[PDB]
Amino acid sequence: KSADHLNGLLRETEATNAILMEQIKLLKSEIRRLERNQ
Amino acid sequence: SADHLNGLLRETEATNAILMEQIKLLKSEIRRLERNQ
Amino acid sequence: FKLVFLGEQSVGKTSLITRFMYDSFDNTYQATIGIDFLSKTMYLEDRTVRLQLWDTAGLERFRSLIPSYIRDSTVAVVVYDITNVNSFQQTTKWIDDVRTERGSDVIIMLVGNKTDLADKRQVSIEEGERKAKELNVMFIETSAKAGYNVKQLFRRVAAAL
Amino acid sequence: FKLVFLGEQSVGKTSLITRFMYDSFDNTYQATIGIDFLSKTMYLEDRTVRLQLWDTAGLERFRSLIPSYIRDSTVAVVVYDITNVNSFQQTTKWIDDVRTERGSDVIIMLVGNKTDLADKRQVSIEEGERKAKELNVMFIETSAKAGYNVKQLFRRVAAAL
Ligand SMILES: Nc1nc2c(ncn2[C@@H]2O[C@H](COP(=O)(O)OP(=O)(O)OP(=O)(O)O)[C@@H](O)[C@H]2O)c(=O)[nH]1
Numbered sequence: 001k002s003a004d005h006l007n008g009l010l011r012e013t014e015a016t017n018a019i020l021m022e023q024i025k026l027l028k029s030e031i032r033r034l035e036r037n038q
Numbered sequence: 039s040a041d042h043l044n045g046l047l048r049e050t051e052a053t054n055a056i057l058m059e060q061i062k063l064l065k066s067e068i069r070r071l072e073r074n075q
Numbered sequence: 076f077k078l079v080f081l082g083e084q085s086v087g088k089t090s091l092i093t094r095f096m097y098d099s100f101d102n103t104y105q106a107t108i109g110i111d112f113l114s115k116t117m118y119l120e121d122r123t124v125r126l127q128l129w130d131t132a133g134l135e136r137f138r139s140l141i142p143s144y145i146r147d148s149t150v151a152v153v154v155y156d157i158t159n160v161n162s163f164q165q166t167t168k169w170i171d172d173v174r175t176e177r178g179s180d181v182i183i184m185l186v187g188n189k190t191d192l193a194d195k196r197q198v199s200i201e202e203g204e205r206k207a208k209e210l211n212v213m214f215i216e217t218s219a220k221a222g223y224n225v226k227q228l229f230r231r232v233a234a235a236l
Numbered sequence: 237f238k239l240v241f242l243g244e245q246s247v248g249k250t251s252l253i254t255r256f257m258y259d260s261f262d263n264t265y266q267a268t269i270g271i272d273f274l275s276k277t278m279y280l281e282d283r284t285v286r287l288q289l290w291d292t293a294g295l296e297r298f299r300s301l302i303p304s305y306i307r308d309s310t311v312a313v314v315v316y317d318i319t320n321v322n323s324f325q326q327t328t329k330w331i332d333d334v335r336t337e338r339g340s341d342v343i344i345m346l347v348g349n350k351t352d353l354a355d356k357r358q359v360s361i362e363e364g365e366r367k368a369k370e371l372n373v374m375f376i377e378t379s380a381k382a383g384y385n386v387k388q389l390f391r392r393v394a395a396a397l
C-alpha cells in the first residue's frame with residue numbers, strides 16, 4: 001500500500017529535476033553573453 | 039514492484055545532485071566574468 | 076514542505092536564510108544569481124519538519140524562473156527593506172505574482188527587514204501592518220544582522236501548515 | 237542507460253550527438269560549456285531502448301564536473317580528430333580517467349572523427365586500431381559532417397549492453 005507514496009514523490013523529484021535543467025540553460029547562455037561583450 | 043521504485047528514485051536524486059553541482063560552478067563562472075569586466 | 080523568498084534587490088533575502096540556516100551574517104553584499112537552494116530539517120516546535128528553501132534573485136535578469144517555482148512552493152515569504160520606500164511598495168507586485176499561481180491555496184508572509192536601522196527608517200510599522208491585513212497575509216518585522224525575530228519568523232510559518 | 241562523451245576541444249563531440257539526435261550539422265563552432273544534456277528514445281531489435289547523453293566540455297575550465305559524471309555513466313565515448321595528432325594522443329588521458337572511476341565495469345568506444353578530411357589526415361587507421369586493442373576498447377572512425385558511421389556507432393554500443 002506504501003508503493004503509492006513512491007510515485008507522487010518520484011514525480012516531485014522529477015519536477016524539481018526539470019526546473020534545474022531550465023536554470024542551467026539560462027545560466028549557460030548568460031555565460032556566453034558575458035564572453036561576447038569581453 | 040514497489041522495489042524498482044527505490045533504486046530508480048535514488049537515481050533521480052543522484053542526477054539531481056550533480057545538477058546542483060554544475061549550477062554552482064556556472065554561477066561562480068558568471069561572477070568571475072563580471073569582475074573582469 | 077517548500078518555501079520561496081521573494082522581494083526586491085538587497086532587501087536581505089539571502090541574509091535572512093543565512094541567519095536561520097547557519098546563524099551567521101555577512102556585511103559584504105552578493106547579489107543572488109538564479110535560485111540558490113538550501114534545506115535543513117529544523118525540528119521546529121514540539122515536532123519535526125522538513126523545509127526546502129528557494130532563494131530567488133531580486134536581480135532583474137534572473138526572474139524568468141521565479142513563476143515556475145512559485146507554482147511549486149507551498150509558502151511565500153515577501154521581504155522588504157524598511158529604510159527603502161520603493162522596496163516596500165513593490166511587495167504588492169510579488170503578492171500579485173503569487174495570487175496568480177496559487178490564489179488562496181498558499182501561505183504568505185510579509186517581512187520588514189533591517190530593524191537595526193531604525194534611525195534611517197522610511198516605512199512605519201503601521202503602514203506595514205495595514206498593508207498585510209489589506210492583502211490578507213501575515214506580517215512581521217525582523218533584523219537579519221541582529222538575529223531579531225528571524226527564528227520567530229519561521230516558527231510562525233510552520234504553525235500555519 | 238547512460239553515455240558520456242569525452243575528448244579534447246573541437247573534435248566533434250557536440251557534432252556527433254547532433255548528427256544522431258536531429259540528423260543535422262552545423263559548421264559554426266560553439267564550445268560546449270559545462271555539460272549539455274540530451275535524451276532520445278531509440279527502438280532497437282524488438283525492444284525500445286532509452287539513452288541519456290552527457291556532452292562534456294573539451295574546454296579546460298569546465299572539467300571539474302566530468303569525473304562525477306563518468307562515475308554515473310555506464311558507457312564512455314572517447315573522441316579524437318584524425319587531422320589533429322595531439323587530440324589523438326590525449327585519448328589516453330580520457331581512458332585513464334575512466335578506468336579510475338569504473339575500471340572494467342564500463343563499455344568504452346574510441347572514435348576517430350572527421351573522415352571527410354582524409355586529405356589532411358595525420359593519424360592513420362592502423363595507429364587507431366592498434367591503440368584500441370592496446371587499451372582493450374572498441375574502435376570506429378566517423379564523419380559527423382557526412383553522416384558516415386554515426387548511426388553505426390550507437391548501434392554497436394547498444395549491442396554490448
Ligand atoms: N543593517 C542591516 N543590514 C542588513 C540586514 N540584512 C541584510 N543586510 C545587508 O543588506 C544587504 C542585503 O543583501 P542580501 O542579503 O543578498 O539581500 P537580497 O534580497 O538577497 O539581494 P539579492 O540576493 O540580490 O536579491 C547585504 O549587504 C547585507 O549585509 C539587516 O537586517 N540589517
Ligand SMILES: Nc1nc2c(ncn2[C@@H]2O[C@H](COP(=O)(O)OP(=O)(O)OP(=O)(O)O)[C@@H](O)[C@H]2O)c(=O)[nH]1
Binds near residue numbers: 246250292294353382
Ligand atoms: N569536416 C568536418 N568537420 C567537422 C566534423 N565534425 C565536427 N566538425 C567541425 O569541427 C568543429 C567541432 O566542434 P564541436 O562539434 O563543438 O566539437 P567538440 O568536441 O564538442 O568541442 P567542444 O564542445 O568545445 O568540446 C565544428 O566547427 C564542426 O563544424 C566532421 O566530421 N568533418
Ligand SMILES: [Mg+2]
Binds near residue numbers: 132
Ligand atoms: Mg536573494
Ligand SMILES: [Mg+2]
Binds near residue numbers: 293
Ligand atoms: Mg562538446
